[PDB]
Each structure stands twice: as structure tokens, then as C-alpha cells.
Design an enzyme around this catalytic site. Structure first.
Site, PDB file in Angstrom:
ATOM      1  N   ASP A   1       3.655   3.868  11.519  1.00 26.23           N
ATOM      2  CA  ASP A   1       4.368   3.448  10.316  1.00 26.23           C
ATOM      3  C   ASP A   1       4.462   1.938  10.145  1.00 26.23           C
ATOM      4  O   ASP A   1       4.675   1.138  11.041  1.00 26.23           O
ATOM      5  CB  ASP A   1       5.814   4.166  10.359  1.00 26.23           C
TER       6      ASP A   1
ATOM      7  N   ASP B   1      10.295  13.391   4.917  1.00 20.31           N
ATOM      8  CA  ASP B   1       9.026  13.119   4.240  1.00 20.31           C
ATOM      9  C   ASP B   1       8.654  14.039   3.025  1.00 20.31           C
ATOM     10  O   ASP B   1       8.185  13.583   1.938  1.00 20.31           O
ATOM     11  CB  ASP B   1       7.885  13.044   5.322  1.00 20.31           C
TER      12      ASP B   1
ATOM     13  N   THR C   1       3.103   3.820   1.755  1.00 22.71           N
ATOM     14  CA  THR C   1       3.546   2.443   2.155  1.00 22.71           C
ATOM     15  C   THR C   1       2.789   1.771   3.300  1.00 22.71           C
ATOM     16  O   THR C   1       2.573   0.571   3.298  1.00 22.71           O
ATOM     17  CB  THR C   1       5.027   2.556   2.422  1.00 22.71           C
ATOM     18  N   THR C   2       2.249   2.630   4.205  1.00 22.81           N
ATOM     19  CA  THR C   2       1.302   2.206   5.254  1.00 22.81           C
ATOM     20  C   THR C   2       0.015   1.744   4.628  1.00 22.81           C
ATOM     21  O   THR C   2      -0.462   0.621   4.917  1.00 22.81           O
ATOM     22  CB  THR C   2       1.079   3.264   6.342  1.00 22.81           C
TER      23      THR C   2
END
Lengths: 519, 519, 519
Positions: C49, C387, C82-83
Site C-alpha cells: 500500500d 475495501d 491510490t497505489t
């Protein structure tokens, strides 16, 4: 290993040329400053002559070596103008850098300065004055020619010298006579075949022309004649000394009779040589090489006048003025190589012996005898005759005159800031910067002479605009002065043309140059 | 030890060629910049020749040493394309480094460049234009020839010069006649039988072809004729001096008569040699060495015109033109080795003497006499003619012409990005990177001229796509211009094809090379 | 101090983001690699992450400090995208730096990037597929919803997990009912009102929703009720301990009887506090501070079920769910700030006691009990629910879905390389570089899965041309595959759209900024 890229070199080669230029410019104008230059073996040299100051100096920056070759060629044409051209190249180059600064690119700057030059060349026949080919056999009434050989002398020596200018004007008028005309309307001017000799113990009014050559060299032997009338002159390339055999031997001799008989063989070789000169009908002989002592005895016995070591320059001059086309082979005694003079004598002038050959049909080669007191006034009078001849070769080779540093330069600036308006593109910026460089002429004249430059410039602009475009400045009375041709200050057009050319060629070349790889 | 592994040497061998290129591209085009090359003896040399500056400068990257021998070899073929050929090798090479970056195996990158090139090669005879042998006689309709000789003069100079273009054009017309045509549809042009002599003191309108050779060289003694009519010509390899016998000794003489008896024995050898030549029938002789003084007497008595020191190249021409097959041995007096001339005389050019042999059946070897003013315009006119003969030999040895440096490049790049769609794998990426390489030419022309390269390329791209494929660029008015061939600008096929052949050679070789082991 | 000019500061900030992009690319996608981050206290930390890797690290380049704030804010919305989002900014940025090498001013690039992004936004609703509304009750057919929830779980764990997924689907479906709906494909969705409790010692299958709150804290003294029906719940922010007198003293009391009367004075204040509660008619009490032993004696006597110390988050959910409004002021006994439950009991989960409030009129706030085996299967089951709730709130607030990471991008990339053809200036150059970045998405997901990327790019380019635009990459069997929605893989449009907003926001930002002044 020093590397260079990226306009880095151009900033180093503008810098060298600006440094060369702004140092010769303190020595530019008539009231400027002389440099002192000391030689390797210690000799001191003081001059303001700007092709001399670069010559007397080891040149350490590669851009400065290129600019020096431009001056050398220009100095053979105009020995004042060649300083002026180096400053002009410099003042062109710092407008080229401003244009680079604005990002206009050096190629475009190069083409906009050339386009400015093209307008300048179609403006130098309109704005100039043409005095035509001939005032009554090239020199009668004299005026225009009179004015440029006076103006050049007044600028290059300053002060008063009216009793020097009239003798120089007469001397110039006799050289003008040699020269002859074409339907090109210039004159065949050969300053090469012109020869000046300066001798102590008189005054400048005591200078004269000779219609033939004067030889400094020795008649050398007591028995010779010393004046010859209706002289038939042999000029001889070959030595009057015997030549050794193709293959050969020598041995030491005591035994004195066989030594006398070796000599007597060598005297029947010299007496053979003399018989050959005398067979032609030779009354004078001139020999470029030595003459042996026996051969001088037989030349005096036959009643014949010999000269020895006549230098290389004096031999072309002696050819062209008398018709002697110059014996190669004594043995062949060649018969039509004989020249002609009214008279030939040895004369003492200044106490020195001198042999004068004079009375010559249609020579392009004459000799001027330049008399004066001791030495400094004579050297100064030779220099004056030189500078005047060089000015004369420019008016002769084009009958256009123009005033210098006052009118033309300002009119070129104003016609160009009208041209650049009809001109579009990043070419208008180069034309208007070329005009600005013309305004950098004019106000620097007033500054070498010690006047305020920005007020002289503004005042030249304002009188040229509300009055007339003929205005300039008087350096002798040191003030702004109306219609400068009416003040009698003018130049031959070939000094303008040539120094604007060698300034637009050299500045174009420091822009055209980038890399540098050194071994 | 210097080590190499893991594509290391190659990145450094690419670096060498790119750093070479990024310096050479500034003197590639004809608004470019002049480089500076300084001697270890302090002699500075400013020239825009970039293949000469690499040849003359020490090279410390081994992969730039490989590229100089090709640069060297190409400069005798052409004079603008060889600086460009060097840069061209880089421009394929720095698209290969990307392919290498995209991890594509060097074999595949090579093989797609090879394929891309084979596709270009079957497109340069098709998009290419042929003007055949002639349009009238050899050269009378001039057309194709007028455009390549005016264009080359323009590229190698880029300034006004039409009265030089016509005179250089007349020289090119004259050379073609010599050439004569082949069933290929070329001509047999040989610069190895062409000879140009330049002499001062007139104008370029006073240039002419000569049907035979002109020797600058001395015809010797005064006593021989200075002209011979219906001349039978011996060319002789040996000296006219007496050579040394089989077994040899040196004796010390001091008896003077037994030395004169040695000289008179030598004189019966020389009088023999002369009798031999005159038995052969020879009226004129060329002697490639020294001539004894005794033999110059014997030649002048037998009425034989001898010339001395004719250099080896000149001799080759005298063979070809006179049918002279050259006496190896005077002793053998060999009597059918003899050539034939209509006349031989000594004539002055620019005051200087010169011996002309002319009136030569079916002459393959010609002498051009180039008169000029003083030295700079004449020197430049000799250089301008040389570059125009080399461009005439390119057009003559293949009658194909093209609109290169603008149109050919955009047409090829757009054909490849259609070809490359139809090919698959990583071989298809090499074909589109080869396309991409043709596009770095053309716009680099726009940057040299001071214009924006990326903006020219994109504008040139739309105008070749919606407009017409023969769009080029004009660097005189400085714009993109439709139908560039119609503005008298074309290139011979052979400066393009060959420099594209040797650049794909240079880039293929630097792809093929890895380690570096130096002792 | 360090200064910068010449584009340097901006070049050095591209390098910082370009290193960040190429470091986060090793953790790009579900096949990716984990980093190790060791604490200064020695806690070792292993993660993939990118909002965590950036947080655990000391960021030493300012442009990368700029990039950390975008990741954080995106991390609040979604945790996989976002990664990908840190890399995406660089991947446009490294096309911006190419355009600067092309000389393109950063302004033009910003305005061109803006136009690529504006084209993509009128295509991201037209290329998108719309699920529409709440799709029959609580999405009863699931299909599209099943696919967006599986996709997020499949990505953050891989393998099977199917018998975890199905129970998670019963929990998402119960959670979907809670959520309630708004016009035109809007939603009201609260994960801040969702509370999850995990207890060991059973099966995942024994997880449940509760429509009321579960309290981990205890009912205190044993004499209080263990179950209450039709409870009036008082929530108190104030101790059920003394809160001290207004103005006071502190001395050393010895005096045993006065020690008891001070203690009995404290007891009548606790009994007061209970009598105020009992006057409101409260059955339960919630205390966010402590409760005194005396106060627990008096709470059992009135019949009141009290919890002591419950945390600030738990109170916001009980207030909202019971209709409570929270007393800081036991003294004002203000009887309307009182909430209502059908029931309150203390209940066992596992061995632990827990106080459960359930029976609640109208909740938009639920509590989930997550049972499982030991510990790890519950922690993984929590991460997965998290998630999955962040993916559900993104399909719920916009009922459009896309096949992003394969389909969408290539179809944008083909539209842009047709769009930049109709485009002019250097704004076509900026769009065609954006199209190229899109090609850097898609193949790296295939290099990650362990295959060659450039071969994978050409093969999708071709697939999108012979077949249809909806193929994607299988990294579970490592192939490219037609219609990727049929493999069950698709994103909510707001998780693609926002992470593409925050990358075009970032790269635009790093292009707009220059200079650096550091104090």
C-alpha cells in the site's frame, strides 16, 4: 582539455575583438594617443599608427590574429583608414551582440547587416560628389585633388604646414603626370615604380623630380669616367666575376710563376666579358652583382662607367624607365637589351656621391629628390609625400570624393531609419542597429579631440535635420562647423568604401565562427 | 585493465558518435558555422569543413576513429553530403538506442533497419526522376545540369554569383563533351584526366578549354625554338645526364687537362643521346628529370624543344593525349614509342611562361585555363568549379536526380508509416524508428536558418499531406516552399543514396561491436 | 545556498517524482512486490500500500512532499487505485519533460494536458456502461454489484476466498439496505456510522448484522439488571463521580468521624445524580467517563442498567440510532435529550460479555458482529469488508461502471491519436504524449504478471483493431483475453475518474512551479 560549446566561444571572440578595437581607438582620431612598444632586443617604438601597433605586438588571442590580417591588407591602401576600420568592426560587433541578446540569431543578423551594406552602396554614388576625370590634363586649376592631399596631410600631422603642402602638391602633380587615363575614367597609378630619395643640407623648396633613376651605389674605381652624355645603359643580371668549371681541382702552389699564369688566365676571362659589353656599344653599365677589380680596370680603359651592387627594386625601375631589358649572359652579349638616357653622372648631394640617369622618353618610373635640413624634417617630408600619394591613388582610381566622419554617416543613419520602416521581419532590427553603429562614428571624433560627445552628437543630429546634412566638425578649431566640403575637408570615396567593407566582412566573420579544437 | 560488459562499451560508443554529431551538425547546412582548428605550431585554421576537422584532429574514442576513414573517403565523392553523411549515421543510431531501451535484441533492431532500407531503395528509383543522357547533343538543352551546377554553387557558398554560375556552367558543358556516353545512359567522366591551371591578371570570361596539356614548366635553354609546328613528342623517364657505369671507382685528380678529358668523354655520351632522339624523329622532348648543360647545347643545335620537370600526373595525361608510350631507355633509342601533337609552343599566361601542347585527336584529357583577377576570387572560382565537376560526375554517372533535403525525406517517412503497420513483431518498431530518423533531417535545415525546427516540421507535415509531396524549404527568402524542384533546386541521386548507404553502414557497424581490448 | 535558472529547479523536481513513480511501480497491481519499513522503535513493517509506504517514510524531495497530500486524500475514497495513482502522476510527468526537451514552454503543456483531460471526461460517460438506480430493492440480481465487490477483494488478496466472499455478500447486501437513495443515481451512504466487532471461537458463517449498537465495555456492579425491555436511555458525558466543589481547599484530615462525614457528603451527591436520572425515568445509562462504587449501589437500587467508560465514536452511533441527544448536565435533568430502545441486554459472544442495544426505530447506523475461527481469518475478513465498502460507496454514488486497466485507456489512446491529428501547434504534441502515457498503463500490469510489456502493447493495439475494444489482461492465468467484463472484472467509474483527476492535478502542479527559497 578546455572544451567549448553553446555561444561560449562567441562571447570569447567578441571579447578579444572588442578589447583590440577599444585599445586602438584611444589611438584613432588626429588628436589621439601614441603607444609605446618595446622589442625583444630592447628597442623602443612610439607610434599611433595602428597597423604598426599590432605589428610591434605579439598577439595572444586567436580572434585578435584574424582581425590583424584585415588591417595589414587595408594599410597598403590607407595607413589612417586601417585604424578606423578596426574600431568600425568593433562598433559593428557590439550591435551584433545586442541583436543576439534579443535572440535574433547570428545568420539573420549577418543577412540584415549585408542588406544595410547594400543600401549603403546604392547611397554612396548619390550622396557622394563626383569631380570627374580631368581638369585640363588631370591637375590644372587643381582643387579637388589639391583638397584631398591637403586634407589627408592636415588630419595626419595636424597644425600648420602650408610651406610643406605646396611643395608636396607640386611633387604630387608631377607624379600625376606619369599616370594615364582610361574610358573607365580612372588613371593607371603605379606607386610601386615611384622612388624617393632623401638627402641632408638644404630645404624643402630644394626638392626636384628626375626623369630617370638615381643610384646611391659606387663607381668604385679611380680610372672610370664620372659623367656620360647620350648614354646607352646596360643593366646586367649576372656577376662580373669568373665562373668555375663543371668538375674541377685545386692544389697548393709555391712556385710563383704558375700562380701568375692562373691569374692571367682569369684576366683574359674578365677582358673577354668587357669586350662583350663594349661590343654592344655600352657607355654605362649597371651590375646587380659584384664586379671584379680587373674587370673594373678594363671597363675604365674602354672608357665605360660601371656601377656595382644595384638593389633588386632599383633594377625593375631602371628597366621600365630606360628600356634596358637586362643582359642575362655576358657571353651572348645581347644587343637590343640596351637602354637610353640623355645623360648619366656622379653628383655629390649632401656630400654623398650619387649617380643620376635622367632625360627618359615616357617612363612609368621616376625619382624624386627630397632635400631638407638634417633628418627629422626629411623623414617627416617623406611620410607626408607617402600619405599624399596614397590619398592620390584613391582619388585617381575613382574621381568621387566625400567628406569623412560628419555628413555621409549621419545621412546614412537617417535614410536607414526610413529603410527599416519599409523593411519588415527581424531584419528591421538589424537595419536599425546598423544605423546606430553609424551614429557611433562622429561623436567618437569629437571625443579623441576632447570634446563632449553626447552633446556633439545631438547637436549634429539637430542641425542636420532642421538645417542641412553637410555639417561636420573642425578638429583644428575644435568645434561643430557648417557645410564641411565648404570648409574644404574631404576624403577620396575609396577610403570610405574599403573601410565599411573590411568592417562588414570581419564582423560577419566573428559571428560566423563557433567551434575550437586545439593541438 | 579497462573492462566492458552488459551493453557498456556500446553506450559509450553511441555517446562518442552523438557527441561527434552534436558538434558536426552546426557546420552541416549552408547558413552554418565555421570551426577552428589550431596547430601545435600555433597556425589557426578557420573552416566550415567538418569531415576535414575530424580527419585532422586526434580522436580519442575508438568508434570515432572508424567513422573518420569513411568521412575521408566520401569527401573526394562529394563536398556537402559527407559532413551530412556523418551526422546521418547518428540520427539512425539515437533511434536504435531507444529500441535498445525498449529491450529489443540488437539483431532484430538491425534487421528491421535493413528491411526499412530495402523498402527505401526500391522507392528511390521510382520516386526518383530521370533526365537520361541528354535533351539536345550532350549538354545543349542544359536543364538538369544547369540546376545541379547552380544549386551546388549555392550550397557551398550561399550568396549572389550569377556571372560566375554561367562561366562555371560553360566549363561543365565543355567537360561533358569530353566524357562521351555509355549504353547505361551515363557518360565516361574522369576527373583523373581533367586539369585546371589558374592564372592572375584578367577575368573569368578569359577561361578556355585546351585540346592537349599545358605545362607550367620550363623549356630550358634560350637557343631552342619557343615554338614547334607538327611536333613529334618523346616522353622520357630517365635523366638527360650521363649515368654511372656497371662497376665503378673514384680517382683523385689534380692534373686539370685529365679532368677536362673526363668532361669531354661525358660530352660524347650526351651528343649521342641527343642524336638518338633526333633519329627517333622527336622534335619535342619531355624529360622527367634533370638535363645536363652540355646536352641543352646539343638539343638546341639539333633544333629539339626539350621541357624539364613534368610531374607524374601530368605525364599520364600526355600519354593519353599524345599516344606517347614513353622511352624507358635512351640506349635502346626505341623508335615507335613516339607521340604526335599539332603544335608545341611557349606562351605567357598572366605574364608567366607556360608550354602548351594542343591539337590532339579525340582528346580524353583536357587542360582548362582559368584566368582570374588577383587571388581570392580566382582561388574561390577554382574551388567552385571543382565542386561543380564533382556534382557533374554524380549526375553523369547516374542520370537520376531527386528533390532531396525536404521532399524525398517527408515522402519516405510517410510511406514507412504505412509499411511499418503491415509488418508485425519488434521488426515493425525498427521500420517506424527508421521512418522517425528521416524526419530529423529537413527541420534541422529550419534550425540552421534561425527558424523554429519543431514548428517547421509540423507545418511541413501538414503541407506535404493535404497539399503536395514536393514541398521543400527556401533559405534565401527563408520559407517552406511548394514544388522545390521547380525553383531550380535538385540533387543528384548519388549524393543521397550513397551517404544513406554509408550512414546505414556506420550505424550497423556500431551496433555490431562490443568489447575493446587495447595493448 | 543553492540557486537555479535555465529550467533547472523544474528538472530536478521532475526527477524526484520520476524516482517516486518508478519506486511505486514495483508495488503496482496485485502481483506486485512488498516493501520493508523499519521503525525507529524497531517495529518492522512490510506492505504493498502506497498511501502507507509514503506515510512510513521520510520524504526528502519537496515535489514528492507535494505528491504525498494527493495520496492521502485519495486513500479516504479507495485503497488499490491510490497505489496506481502515485505512478500515474509521474507517467504524465515524464511525457511533460520530453515536451520541455522539445523546447515547449510549461504553460502550453498545462493547457494541452487540460485539453487531453477534457476530451477524456466527455468520453468517460459515453464509453461508460450504466448499471442505473438501486437495481431492484437491495440490488437483488446482483451481477454488476457482485462484480465491483469481487474485483476489489480479488485485487487486495488474490487466490480463492470464495467461501469468504459469499458471507461478505450477505454482509454487503444487509449494508445496502441501510444506505438509502437520492435522484439521478445518487446515494446516502455512511461508513462512519458502520461499526464492526470481531469475536473468535466459531465460524465466519456465524457473522451477523445488529440493528442497534454492541458495547464491548461492561455493566459494572453485579446488582444491576442483565436485560431491559422498553428502555429509556440516558447518555451522560459527565462523570457518575464528583466533579468537585466550586471553590475549595485541600488539607490533611486526621479526625476519623469527619472523614466519614466528608465521605457521606460525597455519597449524597452520587445519590442525587441517580435521583435526577430516576426523575427523567431512565432505565439504561451510558457513561463516557467513570461511575463511583456508591453511584453503582444507587443505580442497582433504582433498577438502572449502567455501562461505565464507552469511547467518543460509539456515542455518535448510539445518539443517531436511538434518538438520543447526550447529557453533559445531570443537574438540569432535561428529559427530552433521552433516547429509546426496544431492548438492552448484556450478552455473551465467545467468553466475553458485551452490552447490546437492539430493537431500533429507523437506523441509518448499524453495528456488525464478525465471528470466525481464531484471529487471522477475522482480521483478513475485516480488511476485505473495508475495501469492499469503499468500492460499494463508489458504485452507489454513481451507478456507472467501466473495464478500466485495459479497455478504456486503449480506446482513449486511439481516439487521441486521431484527435491530435485534427489539432495544431504544440498542443497536438502534448496530446500525443498523453496518448503514449496511456500505453504505459496496461503493459506494466502484463510485465508485473511476468511477461514482456512492449510485445503485450502491440498485441492489444492489434486486438483493438481486428476485434473489439473490451479485452483485458488475465494475470490469474497470464494471457490477454477478449471481453474482460465476462471474466467478472470492472471498476466503479468514480474510482477510475478520481485517481485519474488526482494524477492530472498532480502533474499539472509540478509543471506550474519554479524556484526554491529555503530558510
Amino acid at each position: 582539455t578546455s572544451r567549448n560549446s553553446g555561444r561560449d566561444a562567441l562571447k570569447n571572440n567578441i571579447l578579444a575583438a572588442r578589447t583590440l578595437a577599444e585599445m586602438l581607438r584611444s589611438s584613432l582620431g588626429p588628436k589621439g594617443l601614441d603607444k609605446m612598444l618595446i622589442d625583444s632586443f630592447g628597442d623602443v617604438t612610439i607610434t599611433n599608427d595602428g597597423a604598426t601597433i599590432v605589428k610591434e605586438m605579439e598577439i595572444q588571442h586567436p580572434a585578435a590574429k584574424l582581425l590583424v590580417e584585415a588591417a595589414k591588407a587595408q594599410d597598403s591602401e590607407v595607413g589612417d583608414g586601417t585604424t578606423s576600420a578596426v574600431v568600425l568592426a568593433g562598433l559593428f560587433l557590439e550591435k551584433a551582440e545586442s541583436l543576439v541578446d534579443q535572440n535574433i540569431h547570428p545568420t539573420i543578423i549577418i543577412e540584415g547587416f549585408k542588406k544595410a551594406f547594400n543600401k549603403s552602396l546604392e547611397l554612396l554614388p548619390q550622396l557622394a560628389t563626383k569631380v570627374d576625370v580631368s581638369d585640363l590634363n588631370s591637375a590644372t586649376a587643381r582643387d579637388a585633388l589639391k583638397k584631398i592631399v591637403y586634407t589627408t596631410m592636415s588630419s595626419k600631422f595636424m597644425a600648420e604646414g602650408e610651406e610643406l603642402n605646396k611643395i608636396m602638391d607640386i611633387v604630387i602633380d608631377a607624379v600625376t603626370t606619369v599616370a594615364e587615363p582610361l574610358p573607365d575614367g580612372g588613371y593607371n597609378v603605379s606607386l610601386d615604380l615611384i622612388k624617393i630619395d632623401k638627402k641632408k643640407g638644404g630645404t624643402i623648396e630644394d626638392s626636384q623630380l628626375i626623369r630617370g633613376i638615381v643610384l646611391d651605389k659606387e663607381v668604385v674605381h679611380a680610372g672610370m669616367p664620372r659623367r656620360v652624355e647620350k648614354a646607352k645603359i646596360a643593366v646586367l643580371d649576372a656577376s662580373l666575376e669568373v665562373e668555375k668549371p663543371e668538375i674541377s681541382a685545386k692544389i697548393s702552389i709555391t712556385s710563383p710563376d704558375q700562380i701568375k699564369a692562373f691569374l692571367d688566365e682569369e684576366a683574359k676571362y674578365l677582358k673577354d666579358m668587357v669586350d662583350k659589353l663594349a661590343s654592344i656599344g655600352a657607355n654605362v653599365v649597371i651590375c646587380q652583382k659584384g664586379i671584379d677589380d680587373i674587370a673594373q680596370h678594363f671597363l675604365a680603359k674602354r672608357g665605360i662607367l660601371a656601377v656595382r651592387r644595384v638593389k633588386r627594386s632599383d633594377i625593375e625601375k631602371l628597366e621600365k624607365a630606360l628600356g634596358a631589358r637586362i643582359i642575362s649572359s655576358i657571353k651572348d652579349a645581347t644587343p637590343e637589351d640596351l637602354g637610353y638616357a640623355e645623360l648619366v653622372e656622379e653628383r655629390k648631394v649632401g656630400n654623398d656621391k650619387m649617380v643620376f640617369i635622367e632625360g627618359a622618353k615616357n617612363p612609368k618610373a621616376v625619382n624624386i629628390l627630397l632635400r631638407g635640413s638634417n633628418d627629422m624634417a626629411l623623414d617627416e617630408a617623406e611620410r607626408s609625400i607617402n600619405d599624399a600619394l596614397y590619398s592620390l591613388r584613391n582619388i585617381l582610381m575613382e574621381p568621387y570624393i566625400v567628406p569623412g566622419g560628419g555628413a555621409i554617416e549621419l545621412e546614412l543613419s537617417a535614410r536607414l531609419r526610413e529603410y527599416a520602416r519599409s523593411v519588415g521581419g527581424k531584419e528591421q532590427l538589424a537595419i536599425e542597429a546598423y544605423a546606430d553603429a553609424l551614429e557611433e562614428i562622429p561623436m567618437i571624433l569629437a571625443e579623441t579631440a576632447g570634446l563632449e560627445p553626447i552633446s556633439a552628437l545631438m547637436d549634429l543630429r539637430a542641425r542636420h535635420a532642421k538645417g542641412l546634412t553637410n555639417c561636420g566638425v573642425d578638429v583644428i578649431n575644435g568645434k561643430i562647423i557648417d557645410d564641411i566640403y565648404s570648409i574644404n575637408v574631404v576624403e577620396p570615396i575609396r577610403v570610405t568604401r574599403q573601410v565599411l567593407k573590411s568592417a562588414t566582412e570581419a564582423a560577419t566573420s566573428i559571428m560566423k565562427i563557433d567551434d575550437l579544437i586545439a593541438a
